[PDB]
Structure formats: C-alpha cells, structure tokens
Design a protein around this motif. Sequence first.
Motif, PDB file in Angstrom:
ATOM      1  N   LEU A 127       0.758  -1.270  -0.015  1.00 11.39           N
ATOM      2  CA  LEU A 127      -0.141   0.179   0.023  1.00 11.39           C
ATOM      3  C   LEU A 127       0.863   1.284   0.120  1.00 11.39           C
ATOM      4  CD1 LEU A 127      -3.021  -1.236   2.515  1.00 11.39           C
ATOM      5  CD2 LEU A 127      -2.924  -0.807  -0.162  1.00 11.39           C
ATOM      6  N   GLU A 128       0.521   2.366  -0.954  1.00  7.82           N
ATOM      7  CA  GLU A 128       1.221   3.451  -0.816  1.00  7.82           C
ATOM      8  C   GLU A 128       1.078   4.414   0.262  1.00  7.82           C
ATOM      9  OE1 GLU A 128       2.762   1.900  -4.429  1.00  7.82           O
ATOM     10  OE2 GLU A 128       3.477   3.527  -3.151  1.00  7.82           O
ATOM     11  N   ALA A 129      -0.038   4.656   0.874  1.00  6.61           N
ATOM     12  CA  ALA A 129      -0.452   5.678   1.912  1.00  6.61           C
ATOM     13  C   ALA A 129      -1.507   5.164   2.642  1.00  6.61           C
ATOM     14  CB  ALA A 129      -0.834   6.812   1.070  1.00  6.61           C
ATOM     15  N   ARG A 171       1.490  13.071  -2.701  1.00  2.00           N
ATOM     16  CA  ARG A 171       2.967  12.683  -2.425  1.00  2.00           C
ATOM     17  C   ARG A 171       3.295  11.434  -2.454  1.00  2.00           C
ATOM     18  NH1 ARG A 171       7.216  11.575  -2.389  1.00  2.00           N
ATOM     19  NH2 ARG A 171       8.931  12.466  -1.544  1.00  2.00           N
ATOM     20  N   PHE A 172       2.415  10.580  -2.120  1.00  2.30           N
ATOM     21  CA  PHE A 172       2.484   8.913  -1.767  1.00  2.30           C
ATOM     22  C   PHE A 172       1.980   8.192  -2.802  1.00  2.30           C
ATOM     23  CE2 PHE A 172       4.204  11.268   2.111  1.00  2.30           C
ATOM     24  CZ  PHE A 172       5.473  10.798   1.775  1.00  2.30           C
ATOM     25  N   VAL A 173       0.687   8.513  -3.168  1.00  2.00           N
ATOM     26  CA  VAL A 173      -0.160   7.445  -4.219  1.00  2.00           C
ATOM     27  C   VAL A 173       0.745   7.775  -5.472  1.00  2.00           C
ATOM     28  CG1 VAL A 173      -2.223   6.952  -5.114  1.00  2.00           C
ATOM     29  CG2 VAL A 173      -1.995   7.292  -2.751  1.00  2.00           C
ATOM     30  N   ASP A 174       0.898   9.123  -5.788  1.00  2.00           N
ATOM     31  CA  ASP A 174       1.460   9.553  -7.228  1.00  2.00           C
ATOM     32  C   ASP A 174       2.844   9.725  -7.093  1.00  2.00           C
ATOM     33  OD1 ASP A 174      -1.379   9.477  -7.741  1.00  2.00           O
ATOM     34  OD2 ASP A 174      -1.424  11.480  -8.057  1.00  2.00           O
ATOM     35  N   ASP A 175       3.515   9.756  -5.840  1.00  4.74           N
ATOM     36  CA  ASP A 175       5.164  10.168  -5.688  1.00  4.74           C
ATOM     37  C   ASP A 175       5.164  11.405  -6.243  1.00  4.74           C
ATOM     38  OD1 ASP A 175       5.366   7.656  -4.386  1.00  4.74           O
ATOM     39  OD2 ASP A 175       6.336   6.831  -6.368  1.00  4.74           O
ATOM     40  N   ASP A 176       4.263  12.408  -6.041  1.00  2.55           N
ATOM     41  CA  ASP A 176       4.205  13.708  -6.743  1.00  2.55           C
ATOM     42  C   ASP A 176       4.786  14.525  -5.937  1.00  2.55           C
ATOM     43  OD1 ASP A 176       3.387  15.938  -7.888  1.00  2.55           O
ATOM     44  OD2 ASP A 176       1.475  15.452  -8.408  1.00  2.55           O
TER      45      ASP A 176
HETATM   46 NA    NA Z   1       4.064   5.704  -3.664  1.00  2.54          NA
END
Ligand code: NA
Length: 258
Positions: free
Chosen positions: A146-148, A228-233
């Motif tokens: 999971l990303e976030a 920031r964390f699902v999209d690494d934006d």
């Molecule tokens: Na991520």
Amino acid sequence: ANPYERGPDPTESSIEAVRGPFAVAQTTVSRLQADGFGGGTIYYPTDTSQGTFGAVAISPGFTAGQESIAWLGPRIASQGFVVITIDTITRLDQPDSRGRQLQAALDHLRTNSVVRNRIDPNRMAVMGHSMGGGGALSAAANNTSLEAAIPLQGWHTRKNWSSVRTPTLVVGAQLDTIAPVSSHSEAFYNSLPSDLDKAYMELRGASHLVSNTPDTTTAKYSIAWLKRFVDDDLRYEQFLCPAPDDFAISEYRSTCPF
Ligand code: NA
C-alpha cells in the motif's frame, strides 16, 4: 518525468478547494455486489485522457455508516483519485476487520466495470475515521505494497505500529474524548518506524466529529499526502514539509524531508 502526476501545479488554494480540477461522477456498489465489505460509493474522475488514477478506500467508525465520511469521497476524487467510501459488513466490526474490508474494497475496484479501466491497481491507499482509522493502520500493517495510509482520529487497541512500511499521516483532534490523541493518534505516530515517511497533525480545537462534516484542514493535507505518496508527486511535498504555518494545526511532527 513522473508519469503519475495529474492536474496542474498546486498551490495552497488548489488543495483547499472543495472540488479540484477533475470533474467527478459516482457509482454505487451494493452490499450484495461487495465481496468482503458492506458496499460503498465510488467517486471517480470522468476525464479518461490524462491516464489512470490511484485508488483510495475510506472507512467510517464504530456504529457509523458511509454517510459519516461521504464528503471526503468527491473532494478527494476531484484531485485525481478513484475513491470508495465503504459501509462495513456490520456496524459493530472492530478495527482489524475494518482493515480487511478496506483492502477488499480496494480489490473490488479492478472488477468494477465503471472504474476498472480508470485505476492503476498498483497504487492504492487507505483512510478511515475512528475505528476505520485503526482499520487503515491494520490494512497497511497487512499489506506492505500500500502506498499511503491516513487514520483520522484513529481508534485501536493496538498501539505498536512498528511493522508498517506505508507512508502514514496521522491526523488527531486536539479535544477528542473518544479517541484521545495521547493514547491513540500520538501513540500510533510514535511507534511507526522512525525511518518511515510519516507525519502527525493535530487539529486545533477539534472534536472527534471533525471528520464527519467538511473540514478544509483535513482535506487539504489528506490530498497533499495522497498526491505525495500515491502518485509520488514531489510538487506536493511543500505543503507537508516542514510544519505548516497554519493556525488550524495545534501540533505537527514529521520525518521530513521525504
Ligand atoms: Na508511492
């Protein structure tokens, strides 16, 4: 270039907006259609031309329905996410069960004809209020992909989250008497690994119920965290690091820079 970036470059105003740059629609998952959760509502961007989007599942708390967290669905989805707000199998489900149901709701999206072709199933996140926030922590502890994770006034009997490997934003409510920050939210932040990308934000003057009607502070930082964390934006790190200069936040801690 980061292929997961969606939408124009952000500002404070863009993350505070009630609706972001993506028009959204919704579809219902009945209890009968839902395997492993109680049904829900999926909010999704209608524009197909910008790529697929990350997915987010949101759980309510004890004895609560999806209606108690519904406003988060379209507010987040309109920033470029497919967001499912769930009902639980029963109103009495405890946090660990809610975590498994959050994961089941995420996994449902790839089988849903309306949204399956709009998601990247490799980029998923969990959120929840109260026991649903405890559920978000449990889901992260049970799925290191999971990303976030974002617990909102989370409640859990488990205080040690040292096995979580998912970037986590813990949102406490200063005046909360149901999931008090000292024994819930702050304890969770303190036991998450010291080298995890994580933050704690306490909402000044807020009750346990802050997540159940629209709250701009909750929305703006949840949006920034998911970006920031699902999209690494990386365009959204400025809102998370260092502590915001924001009177609505009474306490902040983080492992910035991420
Ligand atoms: Na991520």
